[PDB]
Amino acid sequence: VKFQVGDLVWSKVGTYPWWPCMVSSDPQLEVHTKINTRGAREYHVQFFSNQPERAWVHEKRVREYKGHKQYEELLAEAQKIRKPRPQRERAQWDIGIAHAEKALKMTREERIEQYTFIYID
Numbered sequence: 081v082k083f084q085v086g087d088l089v090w091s092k093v094g095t096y097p098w099w100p101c102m103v104s105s106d107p108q109l110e111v112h113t114k115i116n117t118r119g120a121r122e123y124h125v126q127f128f129s130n131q132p133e134r135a136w137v138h139e140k141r142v143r144e145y146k147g148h149k150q151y152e153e154l155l156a157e158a159q160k161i162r163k164p165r166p167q168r169e170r171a172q173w174d175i176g177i178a179h180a181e182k183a184l185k186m187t188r189e190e191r192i193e194q195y196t197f198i199y200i201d
């Protein structure tokens with residue numbers, strides 16, 4: 081178990097770019113990590129965004145968030161070929177990064193307090 085609740089991570093989910101997140105406990109399972117139905121480890125994360133979302137993410141698609149400038153190192157893992165950055169998505173990503181940069185300056189307990197989502201049935 082590489083990550084704990086409140087840890088800042090980048091997550092690569094679906095068609096979206098590497099995205100700033102916080103590890104958190106699933107509101108129903110009450111765990112932040114599990115072994116999936118294919119036998120692989122996953123972590124439960126919250127995406128920093130103006131549109132809050134959560135997901136279970138394979139451990140290979142989760143990375144410690146050390147700072148926003150790490151994005152270039154993540155793009156490297158994959159003439160130089162670069163994907164363009166769609167305007168609306170870029171704007172949402174910049175918002176998420178601003179929150180993650182603020183969270184980086186907080187303690188783990190402060191981050192848990194400030195950002196853990198409230199889930200309503």
Ligand SMILES: Cc1noc(C)c1-c1n[nH]cc1-c1ccncc1
Pocket residue numbers: 092093094095096097099127128129130131132133134135172
């Ligand atoms: C959208 C969306 N909805 O559910 C999930 C999961 C996502 C998602 N996947 N990868 C990144 C995001 C995300 C991007 C922007 N804001 C929040 C979440």
